[PDB]
Paper text:
[name] and [name] are the two most potent toxins produced by mosquitocidal [name] subsp. israelensis and jegathesan, respectively. Cyt1Aa, [name], and co-crystallized Cry4Aa and Cry4Ba. These are produced during sporulation and are remarkably stable in a variety of conditions, but dissolve after ingestion under the high alkaline pH levels characteristic of the larval mosquito midgut. Solubilized protoxins are activated by insect gut proteases enabling binding to gut cell membranes, subsequent oligomerization, and ultimately gut cell lysis leading to larval death. [name] and [name] structures maintain the three-domain organization characteristic of Cry δ-endotoxins.
We then focused on [name] E583, a residue sitting at the intramolecular interface between domain I and domain III. This β21 residue, condemned to be anionic at higher pH, takes part in the water-mediated hydrogen bond network that connects α6 and α7 from domain I with domain III. We asked whether or not suppression of the pH sensitivity of the network would stabilize the monomer at high pH, thereby increasing the tolerance of crystals to pH elevation. This was indeed the case, with an SP50 (pH at which 50% of crystals are dissolved) of 12.6 ± 1.0 for crystals of the [name] mutant, compared to 11.2 ± 1.0 for WT [name] crystals. The dissolution profile was also altered, showing a reduced slope and no visible plateau up to pH 14. Thus, the alteration of the protonation state of residues and water molecules at the intramolecular interface between domain I and domain III may be involved in the early step of [name] crystal dissolution. To evaluate the significance of these changes, we characterized the distribution in size of crystals of [name]-WT, Y449F, F17Y and [name] using AFM. All three mutants had a significantly reduced volume compared to WT [name], due to a reduced thickness of the crystals. The structures of the other three mutants were determined, using the WT structure as a molecular replacement model for the phasing of diffraction data. We found that neither overall packing, tertiary structure nor interface formation is affected in the tested mutants at neutral pH.
Author numbering:
A (entry chain A): 14 to 353, 357 to 643
B (entry chain A): 216 to 353, 357 to 643
C (entry chain A): 323 to 353, 357 to 429
Write the structure that this text describes.
């Protein structure tokens, strides 16, 4: 309807991810996870969520979310939410003001604390109305963040706020319960809305997921990291731009095929991308048209795991790779003659685009133009990756569509199979060995994945480099060196990572290795600890084992008993030094291994991430075993 | 075909004796041959020696540590213009070993039509028959069939014999073909071009382990450096093959391809383990044809990242003494020096124990490394251990470097003695 | 219209004119139904009395996602030229007392 430029499918430019309304909240949250300032963090959180006792920041958050997900709220609902905001604001102001008086009465502080916690618990369900959950899931996320913070301060400042030891233990129990209940409710709302939107179109589900990756899931990871003091809050989720027609995708089909095709080789850099382009202007009575028949991303050139998503065929002569040379383009030109000329072209070609000299694309300009003709939809495409014009439209000028995000870079380019059943090869599409491809006559869509800049070192050096200055390191499970067979990719966005590893191998063993390197100036005498995040639904009689392997100098770091638990659990090893592992500034084959024995039919266990933190900077503040 | 016949002869009259020579300096090891005999039925195809150990042998072996579970043929029959006699073509062979890996692919082609419809609608296309009728005033229906024949492994997991044969026919300096295929007791294909005499492919003391083909009419000089043991796709496109190759393995290897592990007994005094009978192998590994080792090959490690590792699964039978002392012998060829050396390790449910570390010096010949004595109680392995593993490992290499592993020897300390020193040259 | 039956450009060579082409397709789903594609030439000569007197030609329509499918029934005099493979189609007696079929 308009020929104006687009910005990530939107009519006006979008807000940078570091400039959103929830950014200072997340920044101080990470600062506090690093080092928690007792009996003082709740005031800062309250000043950042309700600045000057005003709900204006929450209205800004609501407006930004409404703009992103294309869902507005009725004025009555807005009035109800503001009423609840002011109700919380009154009690919060009372409690925050009473504490800053030097020499206050602790019993009155205890009363105010109880009133505030009760008021928050009471007004929480107002944001969980599913009819509007898609919009309120962000607003909900902040509220629990205001509450989970409070309780923690209450657990730390005990007799200072008039709490007895039984009060502290009851608060610890309440925290250990709420940190799981809030996550369960948040994930309930997320999965409901995501499945509902994907059943309509994949693009809308991807947009909702991109919104939750910024306003929701980092805070859930922060919740999961609040019981400690010293770990690093870091998000490695990717933003997915979808350009093309609408395709309905089931939720069983998302985490069974579509996400796997979107990720490809999860620990490899994109090196080549190939498109199957088709143009035809047969009978001039019908306008020109263009088709995208298939996308082929190539990461590791010597592995051959990823295959055609769509089809790479250009003709029916069964000649596409013989005579040594692969076919590239076929153009057929037809000439007619009427006594009372107009050559017709039919082109089927393979467009190739390699990775630039700096190994990564930063932006893109992909767009599609629709046309109606006797209740029939014709397409035209425009493709440009970085500075290389891959395809200009032969059907007329098409407005641009700048796909870019400040602080992100293009990591993957894939598509979605259109017009075929997406219910097959679920149990076959593993991480390795098996072929990652799906046949379909056309796709008519392109999906681009932007990864944050903090993951740019791994996809360039294939290893995790350690520095002396940093105090905490987070390693996602997908950034490995090699993984065993019968392993799957599980979408766990609540972990603030691009996924987790599901081991389900009934032979040999299940193992995952990670490459570690040391920078010049790294102290090898400093003591460190390892933290492993795993979910063990079925009992493992051999347990999980964390081992250090360095040029045959294998050393056992930890062995943990695996008991059945339908939730995430953290295992903490004993302290160690890098001189005990025999790793120096010249070690190039250092490896950390997480291993377990073979499983039984129907069993599997999940691995999310790893935390490496100095012994001095790590302390457990809230015990998890006291339920 | 003639090269394969010569190789089958040397596998019986030559190479076992060379292995015996290589094992004469000791006293206690086991002389055992695991070479396979290859029956080739079809037309003649010239193959270079660089192309044999670079593509053809790799396509003939397939998954070297997996049992054959399915075999699919692409059959074509046509009697177009009755002036020309009937003819039959073998357009492609597809062997399927591990159903959940997907490593092996079509050798030839699995296409049946040009409508690009072979896997849509949920169901894979199986057969296409076109029947043509004519009319002359002065009837004879013509058939054109393109189908996919499927044959799974029998109830006893292995075929013992076969009856594959081909019949040639000349017609105006043009060669027409007819085929007959039977695997075990299952008639896969009877010839529609007339009766063809049988051709009993069988060997007393051997069983069918692999069924493959050779690409005909295409250059065999590509994808040499890509066709590895794992990860990469093991396939080669060609319009026709017109040949079938069957590999018979000796009966002594029947336990491994059925139990996927090496079972140990108390009665035997020596055990030999070929390198190809592993549980898992690292990437960037290749198959090297070393028939002088009396095995179906050796492993070439050439990985410039992480590490090069090969693991073997070991199980113990009831009545095995765990207090008896044993030794390990590793046969390797190390052309380029390895500063980290080779390492033999024992991994049993996290009870990892280091068995040996050997300095790797450059040597263009085969060398044996002997570990110190050990007992199975030191490794923590019992009659119930199901995840016992022996690992041979080395660090990453440089560009152009590689090292070879042939076999392993497990013999009791009492029954092993070095009689002729190899270091005294 | 057109008398073509295939795209192999083979309709009158080898002395004999092509009459019928039937292609049968077989599929396989692990979780059979042969498909037929027939293109043929139906021939009907004039009867012994040189003229047809009546006929029974009819067509049946079917709707499927705003797409019209057809089925036909053809009978000239007493010779059944074509019975419908898409289901039974009611008759349509084309005849006039005092007239005879002259052109088709």
């Amino acid at each position: 309807e308009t020929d104006f430029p687009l910005y990530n499918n939107y009519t006006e430019p979008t807000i940078a991810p570091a400039l959103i309304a929830v950014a200072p909240i997340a920044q101080y949250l990470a600062t506090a996870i690093g080092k928690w300032a007792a009996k003082a963090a709740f005031s800062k959180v309250l000043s950042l969520i309700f600045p000057g006792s005003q709900p204006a920041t929450m209205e800004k958050v609501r407006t930004e979310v409404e703009t992103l997900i294309n869902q507005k709220l009725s004025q009555d609902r807005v009035n109800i939410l503001n009423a609840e905001y002011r109700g919380i604001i009154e009690v919060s102001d009372v409690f925050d003001a009473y504490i800053k008086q030097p020499g206050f009465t602790p019993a009155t502080a205890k009363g105010y604390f109880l009133n505030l916690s009760g008021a928050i618990i009471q007004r929480l369900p107002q944001f969980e109305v599913q009819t509007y959950e898609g919009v309120s899931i962000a607003l909900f996320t902040q509220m629990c963040t205001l509450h989970l913070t409070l309780l923690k301060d209450g657990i730390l400042a005990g007799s200072a706020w008039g709490f007895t030891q039984a009060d502290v233990d009851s608060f610890i129990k309440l925290f250990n319960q709420k940190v799981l209940d809030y996550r369960t409710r948040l994930m309930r709302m997320y999965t409901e809305e995501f499945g509902r939107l994907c059943k309509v179109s994949l693009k809308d589900g991807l947009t909702f997921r991109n919104m939750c990756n910024l306003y929701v899931f980092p805070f859930a990871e922060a919740w999961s990291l609040m019981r400690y003091e010293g770990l690093k809050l870091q998000s490695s989720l990717s933003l997915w731009d979808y350009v093309g027609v609408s395709i309905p995708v089931n939720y069983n089909e998302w985490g069974g095929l579509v996400y796997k095709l979107l990720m490809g080789e999860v620990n490899q850099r994109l090196t080549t991308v190939k498109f199957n382009y088709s143009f035809t202007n047969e009978p001039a009575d019908i306008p020109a048209r263009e088709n995208i028949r298939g996308v082929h991303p190539i990461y590791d050139p010597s592995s051959g795991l990823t295959g055609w998503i769509g089809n790479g065929r250009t003709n029916n002569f069964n000649f596409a790779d013989n005579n040594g040379n692969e076919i590239m383009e076929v153009r057929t030109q037809t000439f007619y003659q009427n006594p009372n000329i107009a050559p017709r072209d039919i082109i089927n070609q393979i467009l190739t685009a390699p990775a630039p000299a700096d190994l990564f694309f930063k932006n893109a300009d992909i767009n599609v133009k629709f046309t109606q003709w006797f209740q029939s939809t014709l397409y035209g495409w425009n493709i440009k990756l970085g500075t290389q014009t891959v395809l200009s439209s032969r059907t007329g000028t098409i407005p641009p569509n700048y796909l870019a995000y400040d602080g992100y870079y293009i990591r993957a380019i894939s598509a979605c199979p259109r017009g075929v059943s997406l219910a097959y090869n679920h149990d076959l599409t593993t991480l390795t060995y098996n072929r990652i491809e799906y046949d379909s006559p056309t796709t008519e869509n392109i999906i681009v994945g932007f990864a944050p800049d903090n993951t740019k070192d791994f996809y360039s050096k294939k290893s995790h480099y350690l520095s002396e200055t940093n105090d905490s390191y987070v390693i996602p499970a997908l950034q490995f060196a090699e993984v065993s067979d019968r392993s799957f990719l599980e979408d766990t966005p609540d972990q603030a990572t691009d996924g987790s590893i599901k081991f389900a191998r009934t032979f040999i063993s299940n193992e995952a290795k990670y490459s570690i390197r040391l920078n010049t100036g790294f102290n090898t005498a400093t003591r460190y600890k390892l933290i492993i995040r795993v979910r063990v639904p079925y009992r493992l009689p051999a347990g999980i084992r964390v081992q250090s392997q360095n040029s045959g100098n294998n050393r056992m770091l930890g062995s943990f008993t695996a008991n059945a638990n339908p939730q995430w659990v953290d295992f903490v090893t004993d302290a160690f030094t890098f001189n005990d592992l025999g790793i120096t500034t010249s070690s190039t084959n250092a490896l950390f291994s997480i291993s377990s024995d073979s499983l039984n039919s129907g069993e599997e266990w999940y691995l999310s991430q790893l935390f490496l933190v100095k012994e001095s900077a790590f302390t457990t503040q809230i015990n998890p075993l006291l339920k």
